[PDB]
Amino acid sequence: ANFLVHSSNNFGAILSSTNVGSNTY
Amino acid sequence: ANFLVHSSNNFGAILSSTNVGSNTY
Amino acid sequence: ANFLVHSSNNFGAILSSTNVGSNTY
Amino acid sequence: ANFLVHSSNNFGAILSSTNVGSNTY
Amino acid sequence: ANFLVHSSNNFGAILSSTNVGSNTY
Amino acid sequence: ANFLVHSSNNFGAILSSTNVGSNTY
Amino acid sequence: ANFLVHSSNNFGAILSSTNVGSNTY
Amino acid sequence: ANFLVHSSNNFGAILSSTNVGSNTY
Amino acid sequence: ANFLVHSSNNFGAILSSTNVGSNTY
Amino acid sequence: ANFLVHSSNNFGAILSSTNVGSNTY
């Protein structure tokens, strides 16, 4: 619901997707 | 719902997508 | 709903898209 | 609905798009 | 609906587009 | 030295900085 | 030396920095 | 030396840095 | 020397750094 | 020397670093 993310020198991706339906990446 | 994100030197992407339907990336 | 984002030296992208329908990136 | 964004030295893009329909990027 | 954005040294773009239809970027 | 850049629908930034000293972004 | 870059719908950043000294991002 | 880059829907960053000295990201 | 890169829907980073000295990421 | 990279839906990073010296990641 309420996500706490701290990053440093991020080269890739951060996925914090809370899903109730369908999806593709 | 209410997402707290702190970043530094972000080169990539941050995805915090809360999904109820469908989507593609 | 109400998203709190703090960034510094952002080179990429921050996606905080709350989705009820469909979309592509 | 009401999104609070604070940035500094933003080189890329910040997408806070709340979607009810379809779109492409 | 009512989006609160604060920025500093913005080099890129900030997209806070709330979408009900279709669009491209 | 002589940089050839072609762009279209640029939302972010393009950095082609050739550096001999120090700098921060 | 002479860099050929073609882009489309760029949301982030393109860094083509040729470095002989020191720098930070 | 002469780098040929073609991109589309770039959300992150492209680093083509040719380095002879030191640097940090 | 001359690097040919083609991308699509890049969310992270592409590092094509040819190094003769030292550096950190 | 001349590296040919084609990608699609890249979430992480691609490192094609040709090294003659020392470096850390």
Author numbering:
A (entry chain J), B (entry chain H), C (entry chain F), D (entry chain D), E (entry chain B), F (entry chain A), ...: 13 to 37
What's in the article?
By applying the proposed strategies, we have resolved the structure of the dominant hIAPP polymorph, formed in vitro at pH 7.4, to a final resolution of 4 Å. The enhanced ice coverage and the abundance of monodisperse fibril filaments observed with HEPES buffer facilitated the determination of fibril structures formed at physiological pH. Notably, over 80% of the particles corresponded to the same polymorph, with only a minor fraction representing polymorphs with longer crossover distances. The resolution of the reconstructed 3D structure after Bayesian polishing was determined to be 4.01 Å based on the Fourier shell correlation at the 0.143 criterion. The final map presented clear density for the majority of the peptide, which enabled the construction of an accurate model. Cryo-EM results also undoubtedly show that the N-terminus of aggregated hIAPP is outside the amyloid core, and instead forms flanking regions that are exposed to potential interactions with monomeric rIAPP. The double S polymorph observed at pH 7.4 is consistent with previously reported structures from both ex vivo and in vitro studies conducted at pH 6 (38,66).
In this study, we outline critical insights from hundreds of grid optimization efforts to uniformly distribute helically twisted amyloid fibrils formed by the human islet amyloid polypeptide (hIAPP) at physiological pH. hIAPP is a hormone peptide associated with the β cell loss in type 2 diabetes. It exhibits diverse polymorphism and has been a particularly challenging study case for both solid-state NMR and cryo-EM. The human islet amyloid polypeptide (hIAPP) serves as a notable example, as the majority of reported structures have relied on the use of nonphysiological pH buffers, N-terminal tags, and seeding.
